[PDB]
A = this chain, B = another copy of it.
Amino acid sequence: NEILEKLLKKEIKPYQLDDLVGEKEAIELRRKYIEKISQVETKHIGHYTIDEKEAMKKNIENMIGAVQIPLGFAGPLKINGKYANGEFYVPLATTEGALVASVNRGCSIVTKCGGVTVRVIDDKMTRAPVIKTESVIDAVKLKEWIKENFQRIKEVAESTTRHGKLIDINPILIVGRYVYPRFVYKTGDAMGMNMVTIATEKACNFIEEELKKENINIHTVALSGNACVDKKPAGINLIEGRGKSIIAEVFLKEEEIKKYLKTTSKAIEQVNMYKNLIGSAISNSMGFNAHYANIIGALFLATGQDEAHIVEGSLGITVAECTEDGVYFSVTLPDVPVGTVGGGTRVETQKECLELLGCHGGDKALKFAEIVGATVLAGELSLIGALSVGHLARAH
């Protein structure tokens, strides 16, 4: 009580409440502090089963409760991957109606036709700092020095982490006298948000010192130089890739398309071409798809991924082609940063969804990436197929 009055007078801030009073009681006190400023009473945000101690330590600050996202599931989904095999039930958490229904319909169609073939094309997490040099001459010198002394930098970077490994620094961009070297790391099963930052920091300080020994003065302005590129849509991430680069594909027979999707192959090809290809092209889109972000989002929320990386998951191309036997349908997601350890996967409810996939813990990130790609193709196929049905009806 005496505590609540000091916050209203702004004597103490809500952030030091965890040190004064217990963390669990600090949350009940911060919930009532806003209830009185806004003058409204809350009922639902109070209830949570998640551990408030580890949450305040690794996932949230100034906690007042928890928000509840409705959780559904789509399945069965037969996946023909290299790390994920068998029928799966994908948990999806969204507030949008018809979305889980869309994916669930696509899952059933795909499973009765042999399943999705999905492969992880690449796996890397990047961090591109911005380093200021005195002149372009020093920038050229810095680029050359980094290329020859890679092995030394690798040792310095890898000393910060037991799981991360530096595999390349390419490309190394130069704008005038500013250099953007793209550190490429293997992060194991983690997404590696903070891992690559710690490794890159020591590598930058090491690079900073060794050049000082040769009368070349440089200094790092920021470890995230917006060439990473993190939580933004960028061409470098469409071409060179980032996180897990995934491709999923299916071959459907004309009989299966008419039986389950109630349409024809050339109708799917036409919808995909006018919408996903030409439509995205003339509107200058980087997402030559229809549904990636929607499916990424629901699956990202359930498993505790970084919400902001849905930005990156929306890039990719959907290719649908008329074959002699039926259609070839594929989705290409060159930018999908995921992890099965750390971050939001430790949160209780999100931890459970990964376990329902068999994907919580080590040696399971690639398995998760193959599920992500397979779930996207199911939803994308369901939608393009539904649009092609309308394309056929209106065609007559």
Contacts and interface: CB of A to CB of B under 8 A. Distances in A.
Q: Which of A63, A281, A294 is the most central at the interface, judged by chain B CB atoms within 10 Å of its CB? A: A281
B73 A34 contact: yes
A93 interface: yes
Contact of A34 (B45, B89, B317): B89
A101 interface: yes
Contact of A61 (B72, B285, B343): B72
A69 B233 CA distance: 25
Contact of A348 (B68, B222, B291): B68
B140 A274 contact: no
A250 to B, nearest CB: 10
Contacts of A61: 72, 97-101, 104
Interface in A61-99: 61-75, 89, 91, 93-99
Interface string A338-373: 000001100111101101111000000000000000
A37 B357 CA distance: 10
A322 B70 CA distance: 45
A314 B308 contact: yes
Given A270-B221, A287-B232, A62 B74 contact: yes
Contact of A66 (B71, B233, B234, B391): B71
A381 interface: no
A310 interface: yes
B59 A233 contact: no
A375 interface: no
A1 interface: no
B43 A352 contact: yes
Contacts of A232: 280, 285-287, 289, 292-293, 314
Which bracket fits the contact residues of A?
Answer: 35 or more
Nearest to A231: B293
A40 interface: yes
A45 B239 CA distance: 38
Copies in the complex: 4
A91 B30 CA distance: 12
Interface stretch (A156-164, A174-182, A252-260): A174-182
Given A60-B97, A96-B306, A283 B349 contact: no
Contacts of A37: 89
A355 B62 contact: no
Contact of A275 (B89, B225, B296): B225
A126 to B, nearest CB: 11
A263 B50 CA distance: 39
B319 A247 contact: no
Nearest to A329: B176
Given A38-B355, A221-B387, A239-B284, 17 more contacts: A40-B356, A44-B50, A67-B349, A68-B347, A121-B140, A128-B283, A175-B281, A176-B319, A177-B249, A180-B279, A221-B271, A225-B275, A232-B285, A235-B236, A235-B238, A239-B239, A277-B278
18 contacts: A60-B70, A62-B73, A66-B93, A67-B302, A95-B306, A96-B306, A96-B344, A121-B140, A132-B274, A170-B170, A219-B395, A221-B394, A225-B279, A231-B293, A232-B285, A232-B289, A235-B239, A287-B311
